[PDB]
Write a protein that binds this ligand. Structure first.
Ligand SMILES: CC(C)(COP(=O)(O)OP(=O)(O)OC[C@H]1O[C@@H](n2cnc3c(N)ncnc32)[C@H](O)[C@@H]1OP(=O)(O)O)[C@@H](O)C(=O)NCCC(=O)NCCS
Ligand SMILES: CC(C)(COP(=O)(O)OP(=O)(O)OC[C@H]1O[C@@H](n2cnc3c(N)ncnc32)[C@H](O)[C@@H]1OP(=O)(O)O)[C@@H](O)C(=O)NCCC(=O)NCCS
Ligand SMILES: CC(C)(COP(=O)(O)OP(=O)(O)OC[C@H]1O[C@@H](n2cnc3c(N)ncnc32)[C@H](O)[C@@H]1OP(=O)(O)O)[C@@H](O)C(=O)NCCC(=O)NCCS
Ligand SMILES: CC(C)(COP(=O)(O)OP(=O)(O)OC[C@H]1O[C@@H](n2cnc3c(N)ncnc32)[C@H](O)[C@@H]1OP(=O)(O)O)[C@@H](O)C(=O)NCCC(=O)NCCS
Ligand SMILES: NC(=O)c1ccc[n+]([C@@H]2O[C@H](COP(=O)([O-])OP(=O)(O)OC[C@H]3O[C@@H](n4cnc5c(N)ncnc54)[C@H](OP(=O)(O)O)[C@@H]3O)[C@@H](O)[C@H]2O)c1
Ligand SMILES: NC(=O)c1ccc[n+]([C@@H]2O[C@H](COP(=O)([O-])OP(=O)(O)OC[C@H]3O[C@@H](n4cnc5c(N)ncnc54)[C@H](OP(=O)(O)O)[C@@H]3O)[C@@H](O)[C@H]2O)c1
Ligand SMILES: NC(=O)c1ccc[n+]([C@@H]2O[C@H](COP(=O)([O-])OP(=O)(O)OC[C@H]3O[C@@H](n4cnc5c(N)ncnc54)[C@H](OP(=O)(O)O)[C@@H]3O)[C@@H](O)[C@H]2O)c1
Ligand SMILES: NC(=O)c1ccc[n+]([C@@H]2O[C@H](COP(=O)([O-])OP(=O)(O)OC[C@H]3O[C@@H](n4cnc5c(N)ncnc54)[C@H](OP(=O)(O)O)[C@@H]3O)[C@@H](O)[C@H]2O)c1
Lengths: 276, 274, 276, 272
């Protein structure tokens, strides 16, 4: 039986520490996409282990609402910021402020993505490139800004949130599959070039996770969903807290020797899911 | 190795190992077919009976190439100017091809852009441009050909990729990411399009002599010689060898191959320094 | 689009149209383990249709004597049948000596010998697992190693290992075969690196589900669900022996002069979509 | 960390000390190297252990040290992973002593440098028998004796050698690639019995027989280490942390995966 989760963008009402509560004490994590879904639960878990956060995505409203829930449930600081990962000046602006407020950033989680089901034949060039732009160029943009502004001189840890869609070429998902495959390759590249600056860089590829926009958009009809979930190895959907725990493992000193790796946390699902 | 020539010029002689009618009367649309690997793929194709359309941004480049290719092989070569990033231009090119030949049987996505640069010095726009050309560019040509012809008649796509992303090669985050995304795209399209009789595969070349790629990315000649003699086959590959493996994938001999990546790199990704 | 023709039994093709030049392997000699039945037999026939003489070697002397009569009957090239278990190195060494005595050289080794059956991992005995590792993995290494020491080390050569995609997603009922074939894939890379400097190319070909083979008969399952998964796979059909032999011939030939350490999958995209 | 097969003098917790409270882990190769440090770090989180390998004096010595440093129980047993009667006997003994086994760590292996043209048939086969057949045998025994009916968690310790076909290592590369494939097959078959199965692939780890054997001359090893992304060797405690992660409830949704914990070394290390 998995750790408890909540379907909405709300904090866990109770929690049991399996990592020590001081694992990230006084560190600061910058989380793109931290106002909703997996990125919000990542923020919440990090703050429950001593970490302050900065959460950044397009909607200033989404992150303000989130930052008050996070701060309230954990007593740590959460700086919300409006920032499109495709706009380098907005990215530079956000990182500058995070540093003005905190004086340091230790961890970057690239969680910002967009996705929707569309057959390749109906997918426009602009549609495909929009997904490449947010997922891949966005991840590069934020990483590259964090490197210049803080990590190159102080070291750091980056976790990229990816997917397994590209492994078997999942139908209706050429855009997301291609974009997140490029992010897994970028992880290797940055691990190589930035390791000498004491920067670790890894990916975490989640399976179908309950209580997320990604599952609502992409899961398909509930009866065919249940049937594929029941046929997957752990016979269930993952939850956001399980994903936040793997991300926390990778962003922490427990993972001090892990770099350039892709941890798949998907209950086995890519091995068995249908690709009709 | 089979012989090759360093320039974007035709082979002075060629020995057939495939039958000279392997692609008789087929039509191959080759992006980047005016130079480097793409020029040699066009030439080898035409020497197996195929007409070509070559397309890239520079009209002067494809015009001069097309005269060379027709002159050497006796088959037809249509040159077109088209940036793979511009759906109007790509649509216009595929129409022009269909108007000239009435069919396209094969698409070779060879157009790419690359250069050496540390990830920390690489600009936001430099990264995105490589993704736009290599990745979104490949998707754009593949989808325009699907809509205009391959959906209704079937077809074969060969994507020219790379091994850079396997080990995260230094100075290459842009190209390594873009070509890894092309390898996933290959699988996605193979699955979606297979039922329309379309095969889609990736061919990843190693370091190839006589190419802009190697000129830009090869590094100093002394350190290049050294990684080369320390790789499994002990030599650079040439363009003719790459054209043979592309021809294999594009031909009825690979009738059961789809969603695959064929690495043709003399074993180099296994031993090259990173 | 119409596949090249094939026949279901271990019999030669009635007609064949060349797509490779008929002198591609003019007067070369290929040693093919498992060349008496199934995929290995069709590989033998196709090679000999391109000028190559063959040695076909497996356990059952009756099987290879009958094959070799048929092969030589249909193509006008020579086929030496030998009885040899790949697990017994004195027998391999003697078979290879005998071939060198007959033909004076060997240019190509195709390692096609394998053992497979459906079995749940919880029912698979220790000896059953080991037996499949011993034939597929040790047996491949053994043959490759004898060929190296008897001829290829000094003369160069080309090796094609026939493998599978089962280990990619951990196909159920196939732990033995999937592990064994994943070892051979790794072995391909290892040997490509060590033996490249002796002018030896080593690649793997991984076939998908193939009509008119013992493999499909044993492992296909009932015809109705077999039909369903075939129809749901990207080319919507089973592969045939002739198509696999064409990919094997490609890799074994001078057209693949710069291909080594690679695994070419030739499965109609089956592993992307087949249920697990 | 500490070079020998000795316990750490001190240890600060990053996972809670009750993470594995009262669980039982059966660790093949638990008497030395990585296996010994895994047993120690598991015991520091509340776990009891069973350490099993061919040498009974090696595991007797290890067990007294592990118990002594941690106050948890460590049952040593002698068994060859290639002999299914012995594996069945050790597993029966662990069950008599403890009544349960929650976790299996398949750490036993044999390796040495040898060019492929010089490796004997028997030398190849031996490495395949220990790493591959051994790992299947222990997993399948544990499945039949306990995991099938009660669930459980397996961590296979593997390697990255097979990725680029590392020279001098055809045996070990092949064997470990087979065990990574087995990880996926068992994850799929046994997931519905509440069994998780993952691989952890370490890189070059200081204070181990692996590194003493396979590292080659010190000057050349220093060089490739400096040229690797984190510019240092891994230690045994870092590997035991990643193995603990996978073996714990923190990895409740991880199955069928390979975690590479090698400092990025396979990405840059020489080969040829
Ligand atoms: C499209 C998205 C990624 C980003 O939005 P955006 O930049 O505002 O993009 P727009 O809506 O302008 O759409 C851009 C292009 O994509 C196309 N597109 C967008 N959604 C699409 C869909 N569901 N199907 C097909 N085409 C689509 C648009 O039509 C437009 O293409 P065009 O110029 O040919 O018409 C949107 O899905 C989003 O913001 N998602 C965030 C939430 C999310 O995706 N969560 C799950 C992550 S797992
Ligand atoms: C850059 C290229 C890929 C694409 O051309 P383009 O679309 O006109 O792009 P631009 O010339 O506007 O350059 C795009 C960005 O990349 C950057 N860039 C180009 N060459 C660069 C180099 N060697 N190092 C770092 N950045 C570079 C530019 O400075 C610009 O960035 P900025 O906007 O931050 O100033 C060009 O190299 C090209 O056309 N190459 C084609 C042939 C080739 O590379 N063959 C090899 C394939 S192996
Ligand atoms: C078993 C095989 C792999 C090799 O034969 P062999 O070396 O004579 O081995 P045996 O007949 O002694 O069987 C060896 C072990 O595997 C077991 N075995 C054989 N077939 C089995 C099956 N279908 N299910 C479970 N176990 C099986 C035997 O019971 C024995 O184990 P045990 O000692 O615990 O009883 C046999 O299947 C074979 O000859 N295959 C060749 C043809 C083939 O497999 N073609 C398809 C490749 S796609
Ligand atoms: C060989 C080993 C794996 C297993 O020992 P064992 O089963 O008693 O094996 P043996 O000593 O009987 O050796 C079996 C074969 O391997 C060969 N072999 C052993 N060491 C070898 C070496 N360094 N180089 C080449 N061949 C070797 C033997 O000669 C024999 O082949 P043969 O019949 O052709 O003579 C041994 O190295 C070992 O016990 N290792 C465990 C510790 C270890 O390897 N740790 C490192 C990290 S895994
Ligand atoms: N959910 C799943 O089952 C699943 C499976 C595999 C992978 N994932 C991955 O997990 C991550 C989170 O997904 P989720 O399902 O939790 O959905 P989500 O809640 O919609 O998260 C996506 C986040 O990205 C932000 N975002 C989108 N575009 C952006 C941009 N251009 N700039 C900055 N921020 C942007 C969104 O906020 P704004 O709209 O405010 O920008 C949103 O908060 C993604 O990386 C996704 O690919 C999810
Ligand atoms: N050479 C190597 O060693 C090597 C190794 C691995 C992979 N490759 C791959 O092989 C292919 C050929 O490389 P090469 O070295 O032969 O280099 P090249 O000669 O420069 O080929 C690139 C071609 O792409 C065209 N092109 C670039 N951007 C374009 C755009 N936006 N739209 C349309 N056409 C475009 C260029 O023509 P215009 O300028 O007229 O547009 C040129 O003909 C590339 O895909 C490369 O990634 C090469
Ligand atoms: N058919 C498929 O769909 C498929 C799919 C994926 C992979 N493959 C691979 O394709 C190859 C051939 O399979 P197939 O389906 O055509 O089956 P097959 O006809 O049964 O071929 C297996 C052959 O191996 C020989 N063999 C078995 N054990 C041997 C040993 N110890 N020593 C020497 N030779 C031995 C057998 O001959 P004796 O009985 O005379 O020894 C038999 O000719 C195998 O490598 C298989 O793994 C097939
Ligand atoms: N060290 C590295 O840098 C490195 C790198 C990648 C992977 N690894 C992996 O990490 C694990 C431990 O390696 P290590 O360096 O720590 O070496 P190690 O100390 O030699 O550990 C190997 C263990 O395997 C046991 N063993 C060997 N054969 C056995 C058999 N037939 N049955 C039962 N037990 C057996 C040995 O004990 P007995 O002699 O008492 O049997 C020994 O305790 C191995 O799986 C290795 O492949 C290590």
């Amino acid at each position: 039986q998995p750790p408890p989760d909540v379907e909405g963008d709300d904090c866990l009402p109770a929690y049991r520490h399996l990592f020590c509560p001081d694992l990230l004490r006084d560190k600061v994590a910058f989380i793109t996409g931290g106002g909703s879904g997996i990125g919000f639960r990542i923020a919440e878990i990090f703050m429950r282990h001593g970490c302050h956060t900065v959460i950044a995505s397009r909607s200033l409203p989404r992150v303000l609402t989130a930052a008050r829930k996070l701060a309230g449930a954990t007593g740590r600081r959460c700086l919300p910021l409006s920032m499109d990962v495709r706009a380098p000046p907005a990215v530079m602006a956000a990182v500058d402020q995070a540093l003005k407020e905190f004086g340091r950033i230790d961890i970057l989680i690239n969680c910002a993505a967009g996705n929707f089901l569309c057959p390749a034949g109906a997918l426009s060039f602009n549609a495909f490139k929009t997904v490449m732009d947010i997922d891949t160029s966005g991840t590069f943009n934020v990483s590259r800004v964090l490197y210049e502004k803080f990590f190159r001189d102080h070291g750091g840890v980056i976790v990229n949130i990816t997917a397994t869609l590209g492994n078997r070429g999942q139908a209706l998902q050429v855009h997301a599959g291609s974009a997140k495959a490029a992010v897994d390759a970028m992880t290797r590249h940055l691990a190589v070039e930035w390791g000498p600056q004491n920067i670790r860089v890894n990916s975490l590829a989640p399976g179908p996770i309950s209580g997320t926009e990604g599952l609502r958009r992409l899961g398909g009809p509930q009866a065919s969903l249940s049937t594929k979930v029941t046929a997957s190895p752990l016979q269930r959907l993952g939850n956001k807290t399980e994903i936040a725990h793997s991300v926390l493992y990778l962003a922490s000193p427990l993972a001090s020797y892990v770099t350039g790796a892709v941890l798949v946390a998907d209950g086995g699902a890519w091995l068995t899911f249908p690709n009709g």
